[PDB]
């Protein structure tokens, strides 16, 4: 309905604002764009489902997220992918892992403080009705 599309537009505005705040954080610069194949050709090999904050923005604008749960699944994928690609005890690996967990924790904390649970419930009930 027209009212339901108003609800999803509000969700998109909220998700763009959260993603923008993550993308401007210097800690998260490594997650802002897709991995360049000419710089790292072996990334495409190990990581089967690449995700980054620019691609999240693209999916918001393509209306792919109907709930905050669907959005947080892609945030979680950014984090899990980084841990997968960086399993060594080496400090370069440990730094990326720390930043990836901070990205995940920051997104969840913003959502916990700023998303009304009733708004998310409405989004989920509209989604389940389709
Ligand atoms: C994103 C990610 O997970 C990742 N992990 C790395 N791991 C290392 O550098 C470790 C690997 N294990 C050995 C020590 N170094 S490097 C790395 C990584 C860092 C930068 C890019 C990159 O080209 N861009 C392009 C635009 O800006 C955003 C990121 C891709 C992968």
Ligand 1 neighbourhood includes 91 CB (under 6 angstroms): no
Whether 127 contacts 66, CB under 8 Å: yes
Measured by CA distance, the residue closest to atom 29 of ligand 1 is 30
What does the block give as tokens for 37? 């194949």
The residues spanned by each domain of the chain are 1-130
The candidate with the shortest Cα–Cα distance to 60, out of 102, 25, 30, 19, is 19
- Phi first, then psi: give them for residue 63, nearest 5 degrees: 65, 30
Ligand 1 atom with the smallest distance to the CA of 93 is: 10
Ligand 1 atom with the smallest distance to the CA of 90 is: 14
d(CA 36, ligand 1 centre) in Å: 9
By what technique were these coordinates determined? X-ray
What is the rounded CA–CA span in Å between residue 14 and residue 93? 32
What is the rounded CA–CA span in Å between residue 62 and residue 42? 29
DSSP 57-126: HHHHHTT--SSHHHHHHHHHHHHHHHHHH--SSSHHHHHHHHHHHHHHHHHHHHHHHHS-HHHHHHHHHH
Ligand 1 atom with the smallest distance to the CA of 96 is: 5
Ligand 1 neighbourhood includes 82 CB (under 6 angstroms): yes
Homologous superfamily assigned to 1-130 = Bromodomain-like (1.20.920.10)
């Amino acid at each position: 309905s027209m009212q339901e599309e108003d609800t999803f537009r509000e969700l998109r505005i909220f998700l763009r604002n959260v993603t923008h705040r993550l993308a401007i954080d210097k800690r998260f610069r490594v997650f802002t764009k897709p991995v360049d194949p000419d710089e790292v050709p072996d990334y495409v090999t190990v990581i089967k489902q690449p995700m980054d904050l620019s691609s999240v923005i693209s999916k918001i604008d393509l209306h792919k997220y109907l709930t905050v749960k669907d959005y947080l699944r892609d945030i979680d994928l950014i984090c899990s992918n980084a841990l997968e690609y960086n399993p060594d005890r080496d400090p370069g690996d440990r730094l990326i892992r720390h930043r990836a967990c901070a990205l995940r924790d920051t997104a969840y904390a913003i959502i916990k403080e700023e998303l009304d649970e009733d708004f998310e419930q409405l989004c989920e009930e509209i989604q389940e009705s389709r």
